[PDB]
Amino acid sequence: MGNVDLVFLFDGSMSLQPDEFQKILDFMKDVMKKLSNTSYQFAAVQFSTSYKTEFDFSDYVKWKDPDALLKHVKHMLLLTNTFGAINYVATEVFREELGARPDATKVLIIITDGEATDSGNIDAAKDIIRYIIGIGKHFQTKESQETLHKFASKPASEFVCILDTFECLKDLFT
Amino acid sequence: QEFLLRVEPQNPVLSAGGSLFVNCSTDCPSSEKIALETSLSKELVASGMGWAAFNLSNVTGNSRILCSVYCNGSQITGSSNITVYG
Ligand SMILES: *[C@@H]1O[C@H](CO)[C@@H](O)[C@H](O)[C@H]1NC(C)=O
Ligand SMILES: *[C@@H]1O[C@H](CO)[C@@H](O)[C@H](O)[C@H]1NC(C)=O
Ligand SMILES: [Mg+2]
């Protein structure tokens, strides 16, 4: 298995309840704990109206502690500008200056309810494997399912799943 | 250039926990994509030029909502704090 630079792009919008946001934080911490001491290195970005890199690859290498790296997170509680968020990750997070490895396979785990308050395209992230981990009552809506298909890698059956069981992520370990 | 996004009703105070009709509108010429940001169950029930109306159901507690739309390529937002008393 080659190196993998993985970015958790998590939804901090008002549409997700406080308990759901906390479940997102706990989920990211758990996935990182299971991937400690592997070819994986991480970064996390919270998105709502704006985007915030909560910790970068260099932070992960130095701390190697998910709990410590995400403890400071404050719920944004604004809009859900997902298109811009994916672009921000593609150009502002996957950078050697922030600890990214040029040789590494780029992976994005987008934890959200699937809604989007913005538009555009994500051509800049065409070389990034994108998973959608759903949470929130809006996830199963027709609007969300149609929206998330524009973000998830194909086929959707392999890259889209729910937070409670995260079945689609188990392949990251094989 | 610079317009406002109205959220009606503004900061409503209701009881029980049924439904609420929210209308997000703007006078911005050729506005694009009106969206309502809320953790409540929502259904788009009506729309016209510069506005969109939604029906929010299962309003059991206080909840803040935000509306957005693109005016002249820029995103503007409106808010409304829903208060529920029992
Ligand atoms: C929503 O508000 C706009 C702007 O005042 C109005 O023109 C429209 O008739 C309203 N629609 C509904 C469903 O009330
Ligand atoms: C309450 O709602 C108003 C919108 O009229 C908003 O400007 C204000 O920030 C809200 N108050 C809170 C919860 O900060
Ligand atoms: Mg949202």
- C-beta of B81 in contact with ligand 2 (< 6 A): yes
Architecture of domain B1-86: Sandwich (2.60)
Chain B residues in contact with chain A using a Cβ-Cβ cutoff of 8 Å: 33, 35, 37-39, 41-42, 64-66, 68, 70, 75, 77
Handedness of CA B26, B28, B33, B39 (dihedral sign): negative
- Which residues are paired to B65 by β-bridges? B80
Across the interface, do A14 and B68 touch by the CB < 8 Å criterion? no
Asked if the peptide bond before residue A66 counts as cis, ω within 30 degrees of 0, the response is: no
The 3-class secondary structure across B4-45, one letter per residue, is CEEEECCCCEECCCCEEEEEEEECCCCCEEEEEECCCEEEEE
Give DSSP secondary structure letters for A63-93: H--HHHHHTT-----B---HHHHHHHIIIII
Contact residues, chain A, for B75 at CB < 8 Å: 49, 79, 81, 117-118
Phi, psi torsion values for B23, nearest 5 degrees: -120, 120
Q: How was this structure determined?
A: X-ray
Closest-CA residue of A relative to B37 is: A15
What token pair was written down for A126? 């065409």
- C-beta of B54 in contact with ligand 1 (< 6 A): no
The CATH topology of domain A1-174 is Rossmann fold (3.40.50)
Residue for token digits 């008393």? B85
Return the number of CB contacts < 8 Å for A and B.
Answer: 39
- Give the closest residue to B77 by CA, choosing from A13, A139, A114: A13
Residue for token digits 């997902």? A82
Say if residues A78 and A115 touch (Cβ distance below 8 Å): no
Structural Rg of chain B based on CA atoms: 13
